[PDB]
Design an enzyme around this catalytic site. Structure first.
Site, PDB file in Angstrom:
ATOM      1  N   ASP A 116       0.873  -1.187   0.000  1.00 64.96           N
ATOM      2  CA  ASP A 116       0.000   0.000   0.000  1.00 64.96           C
ATOM      3  C   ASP A 116       0.905   1.231   0.000  1.00 64.96           C
ATOM      4  OD1 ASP A 116      -2.945   0.894   0.177  1.00 64.96           O
ATOM      5  OD2 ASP A 116      -1.923   2.036   1.776  1.00 64.96           O
ATOM      6  N   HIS A 313      -7.428  -6.174  -1.625  1.00 64.90           N
ATOM      7  CA  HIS A 313      -6.367  -5.295  -1.154  1.00 64.90           C
ATOM      8  C   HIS A 313      -5.620  -5.875   0.043  1.00 64.90           C
ATOM      9  CE1 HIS A 313      -4.189  -1.651  -0.225  1.00 64.90           C
ATOM     10  NE2 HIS A 313      -4.576  -1.798   1.030  1.00 64.90           N
TER      11      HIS A 313
HETATM   12  C1  LIG Z   1       0.898   4.067  -7.435  1.00 67.63           C
HETATM   13  C2  LIG Z   1       0.676   5.549  -7.082  1.00 67.63           C
HETATM   14  C3  LIG Z   1       1.362   5.883  -5.763  1.00 67.63           C
HETATM   15  C4  LIG Z   1       0.871   4.952  -4.653  1.00 67.63           C
HETATM   16  C5  LIG Z   1      -0.603   5.203  -4.262  1.00 67.63           C
HETATM   17  C6  LIG Z   1      -0.969   4.296  -3.079  1.00 67.63           C
HETATM   18  C7  LIG Z   1      -2.379   4.583  -2.537  1.00 67.63           C
HETATM   19  C8  LIG Z   1      -2.518   3.881  -1.197  1.00 67.63           C
HETATM   20  C9  LIG Z   1      -3.914   4.017  -0.609  1.00 67.63           C
HETATM   21  O1  LIG Z   1      -4.522   5.051  -0.692  1.00 67.63           O
HETATM   22  N1  LIG Z   1      -4.478   2.858   0.037  1.00 67.63           N
HETATM   23  C10 LIG Z   1      -5.828   2.901   0.637  1.00 67.63           C
HETATM   24  C11 LIG Z   1      -6.753   1.854  -0.002  1.00 67.63           C
HETATM   25  C12 LIG Z   1      -8.031   1.543   0.829  1.00 67.63           C
HETATM   26  C13 LIG Z   1      -8.209   0.081   1.327  1.00 67.63           C
HETATM   27  C14 LIG Z   1      -9.603  -0.571   1.018  1.00 67.63           C
HETATM   28  C15 LIG Z   1     -10.409  -1.222   2.173  1.00 67.63           C
HETATM   29  C16 LIG Z   1     -11.744  -1.980   1.846  1.00 67.63           C
HETATM   30  C17 LIG Z   1     -11.493  -3.464   1.520  1.00 67.63           C
HETATM   31  N2  LIG Z   1     -10.414  -3.714   0.595  1.00 67.63           N
HETATM   32  O2  LIG Z   1     -12.135  -4.407   1.952  1.00 67.63           O
END
Ligand SMILES: CCCCCCCCC(=O)NCCCCCCCC(N)=O
Length: 336
Positions: A116, A313
């Site tokens: 992440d 994720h």
């Molecule tokens: C590649 C461009 C630079 C890196 C960008 C990275 C962004 C990281 C980020 O914002 N992660 C948050 C995601 C949210 C989780 C989702 C939960 C719900 C479930 N999956 O059940």
């Protein structure tokens, strides 16, 4: 050696802090079984913490690695500075370098792993500190090029681009920080973020709109955390001063600061170019970081191994045994 995932307050590891570049960093430290092969530093993302690596930490210890997994800036027992310049990818990469060298010495090297936002950190850390990084891997997060321009994200998504990141607008603003305060709301937030659902299938999070506040009280048990794991996330996030999510959400407030850093490197610094062995583990069902986003990534690497796990994720935990095997087999080849 017991190789199963860490439990909350697991006695197989140590819980420590060090002062690192003016901040208190908390971390998990696991010592190797056998003479140390390497030190591995693991870097979580949002809204995770060092415990998000609980499947990998004892596995890597059993393979012969010392493991250092910090709570990153803003999270759990680690400081949350008010200055956003502390949260840039370059400053956090420097924190990681100093912390790493506090274990391996200034001349030492580490294996570096991220997920992440941690995935973005570790690619930048390998770019800023090639003296230090012997091998590097990321789960979910592909490489992104050095910024050549700054455009507000509002303008980017209003033109129909990067729509998988539109939730970052909400996260960067006041709403989540103001509404998710205290252990009661933190508990509902984590049920949502780890996949719990409402009576009519309501999801607590979308990549389009972010946190769905009005369903949080109807969200049921998350399939991807058990009851004591969930309470541990609540207790650890509650270590931050209210509003508790200010620190974690500051990771969404640095787009302009990071662009300033990286436009300088795009014009004068060395190219994005990784000569050390690298591994990228894509996650098939990650809607925020979809595998297709890793497009022309391979051109930036001398030695990139690719993998893809069929997982959401939360691939480190949902597919922990598979991710462990991918990392261990790659590490065995990379180091040998
Ligand atoms: C590649 C461009 C630079 C890196 C960008 C990275 C962004 C990281 C980020 O914002 N992660 C948050 C995601 C949210 C989780 C989702 C939960 C719900 C479930 N999956 O059940």
């Amino acid at each position: 050696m017991d190789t199963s995932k860490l439990k909350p307050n697991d006695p197989r590891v140590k819980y420590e802090t060090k002062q690192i570049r003016g901040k208190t960093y908390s971390y998990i430290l696991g010592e190797p079984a056998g003479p140390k092969l390497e030190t591995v530093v693991l870097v979580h993302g949002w809204p995770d913490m060092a415990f998000g690596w609980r499947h990998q930490i004892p596995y890597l210890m059993s393979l012969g690695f010392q493991v250092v997994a910090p709570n990153m800036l803003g999270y759990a027992g680690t400081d949350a500075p008010r200055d956003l310049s502390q949260f840039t990818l370059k400053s956090v990469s420097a924190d990681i370098a100093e912390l790493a060298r506090s274990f391996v010495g200034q001349d030492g090297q580490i294996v570096l792993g991220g997920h992440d936002w941690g995935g973005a950190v570790v690619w930048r850390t390998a770019y800023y500190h090639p003296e230090l990084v012997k091998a590097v891997f990321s789960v979910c997060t592909p490489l992104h090029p050095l910024s050549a321009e700054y455009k507000p994200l509002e303008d980017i998504v209003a033109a129909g681009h990067m729509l998988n990141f539109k939730y970052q607008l909400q996260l960067k603003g006041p709403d989540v920080e103001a509404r998710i305060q205290g252990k009661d709301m933190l508990r509902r937030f984590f049920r949502a973020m780890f996949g719990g659902r409402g009576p009519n299938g309501e999801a607590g999070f979308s990549t389009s709109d972010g946190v769905h506040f009005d369903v949080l009280d109807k969200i049921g048990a998350p399939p991807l955390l058990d009851e004591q794991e969930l309470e541990y996330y609540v207790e650890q996030y509650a270590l931050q001063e209210a509003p508790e999510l200010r620190g974690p959400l500051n990771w969404y407030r640095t787009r302009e600061l990071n662009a300033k850093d990286e436009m300088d490197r795009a014009k004068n610094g060395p190219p994005l170019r990784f000569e050390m062995p690298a591994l990228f583990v894509a996650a098939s069902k990650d809607n925020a970081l979809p595998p297709a986003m890793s497009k022309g990534m391979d051109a930036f690497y001398k030695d990139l191994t690719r993998a893809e796990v069929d997982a959401t994720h939360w691939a480190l935990t949902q597919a922990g045994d598979e991710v462990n095997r991918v990392i261990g087999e790659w590490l065995n080849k990379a180091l040998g």
